[PDB]
């Protein structure tokens, strides 16, 4: 097959889907291809240069929300930021894992910028809202690898509260810890120099 | 050398801190212990095997703030736990990549049921006070992996940002996301069944 930039990156993420990150190759990502391991390697040097490119091309595809609306409070833009983060993480087996330790690739360079930019013009100092921008990432990062991570007689609450995580996604979890974590900026942000 | 438990895990974790996560295998780990991989074999099954009780005996060893000390706001407790819990997942190099999607050992049982009974004696929901328990260690680990996962010409806020994330550890990141997360949970808390 064809073996533009594009559609090798199909092919790999169509191979994510199969075997997860542990069983990804790129031995098997040249049979999937229906090429020799030399060939693949004109295009591709290794395991890493993969993963980096999948990590920014997951974004790309399906992280739609890297940007505020016109006019968007900071509360807002962050909440939206974070769930369609989640879903783009969510949306390939061991995504959270591919994603893991990149660094904002050259071409989302201006994203990542218009965020920090965003937030300072909000009220936030560039510490704090850098703070902010990395909380939720790490929040969001977190309970979605330990989703897909997981993917002796329990004592009584234990049990109970399994049941709840297990009774959906993670999904609630998730949005309530995403609320608790933007109340706690906002109250940050509004005390100024007060104690709070 | 001695092929009891703690020897093992003692072998197993010295190994883990030379060659991190993916380069930990059961050959290696016979090598270090001088005996032959069937003679390992007897001992520990496989890598899973070692790893969940790897993930077990860190937080065993080295997490000494699983309980509150009598009398302790809720709001302390977390803010030492996640602290402890933190501390013990970089001890070891991939520490929280060896701790990831682990489920509670029947070993700690016990304890992980003393911290939500703790919470709903602090006036949470069982549900809010899982939903508060899972943030924090989502929070947590997720700074952590991107800490120890990560060991084109930079637009200004950009380059600024890397370097206070640079500065240090990523300490003061986590410690200030930490406070915004339990405020967060504590105006929720407060607020009882008044819109909030
Ligand atoms: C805060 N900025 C400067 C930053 C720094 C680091 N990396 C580090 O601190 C690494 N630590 C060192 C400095 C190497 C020791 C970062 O690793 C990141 C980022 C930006 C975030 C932004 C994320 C964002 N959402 C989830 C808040 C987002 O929507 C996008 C996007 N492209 O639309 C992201 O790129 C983002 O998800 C993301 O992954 C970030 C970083 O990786
Ligand atoms: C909330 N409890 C019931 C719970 C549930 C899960 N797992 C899941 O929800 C997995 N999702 C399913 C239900 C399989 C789909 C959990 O995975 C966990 C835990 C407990 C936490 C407790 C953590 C705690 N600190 C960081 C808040 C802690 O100090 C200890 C300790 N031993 O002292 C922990 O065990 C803890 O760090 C931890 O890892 C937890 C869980 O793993
Ligand atoms: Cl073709
Ligand atoms: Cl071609
Ligand atoms: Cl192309
Ligand atoms: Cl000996
Ligand atoms: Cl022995
Ligand atoms: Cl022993
Ligand atoms: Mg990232
Ligand atoms: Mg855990």
Redesign the interface.
């Given at each position: 097959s064809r073996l533009n930039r594009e559609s090798v990156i199909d092919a790999a993420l169509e191979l994510l889907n199969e075997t997860g990150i542990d069983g990804l190759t790129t031995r098997k990502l040249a049979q999937k291809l229906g090429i020799e391991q030399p060939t693949l390697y004109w295009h591709v040097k290794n395991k890493r240069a993969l993963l980096d490119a999948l990590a920014v091309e997951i974004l790309a595809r399906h992280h739609d929300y890297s940007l505020p609306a016109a006019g968007e409070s900071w509360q807002s833009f962050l909440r939206n930021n974070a769930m369609s983060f989640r879903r783009a993480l969510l949306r390939y087996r061991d995504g959270a894992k591919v994603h893991?330790?990149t660094?904002?690739?050259?071409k989302q360079?201006?994203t990542?910028?218009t965020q920090?930019?965003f937030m300072?013009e909000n009220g936030f100092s560039?510490?704090?809202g850098?703070?902010?921008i990395?909380?939720v990432?790490?929040?969001?990062?977190?309970?979605v690898?330990?989703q897909?991570?997981?993917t002796?007689?329990?004592?009584?609450?234990?049990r109970?509260?399994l049941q709840?995580?297990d009774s959906d996604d993670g999904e609630?979890?998730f949005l309530?810890?995403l609320?608790?974590?933007?109340?706690?900026?906002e109250?940050?942000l509004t005390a100024l120099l007060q104690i709070v």
């Amino acid at each position: 097959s064809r073996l533009n930039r594009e559609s090798v990156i199909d092919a790999a993420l169509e191979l994510l889907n199969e075997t997860g990150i542990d069983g990804l190759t790129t031995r098997k990502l040249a049979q999937k291809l229906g090429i020799e391991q030399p060939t693949l390697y004109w295009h591709v040097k290794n395991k890493r240069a993969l993963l980096d490119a999948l990590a920014v091309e997951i974004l790309a595809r399906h992280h739609d929300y890297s940007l505020p609306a016109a006019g968007e409070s900071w509360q807002s833009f962050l909440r939206n930021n974070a769930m369609s983060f989640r879903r783009a993480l969510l949306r390939y087996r061991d995504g959270a894992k591919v994603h893991l330790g990149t660094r904002p690739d050259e071409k989302q360079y201006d994203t990542v910028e218009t965020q920090l930019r965003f937030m300072t013009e909000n009220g936030f100092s560039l510490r704090d809202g850098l703070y902010a921008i990395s909380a939720v990432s790490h929040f969001t990062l977190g309970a979605v690898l330990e989703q897909q991570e997981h993917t002796e007689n329990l004592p009584p609450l234990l049990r109970e509260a399994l049941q709840i995580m297990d009774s959906d996604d993670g999904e609630q979890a998730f949005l309530h810890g995403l609320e608790s974590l933007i109340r706690g900026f906002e109250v940050q942000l509004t005390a100024l120099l007060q104690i709070v």
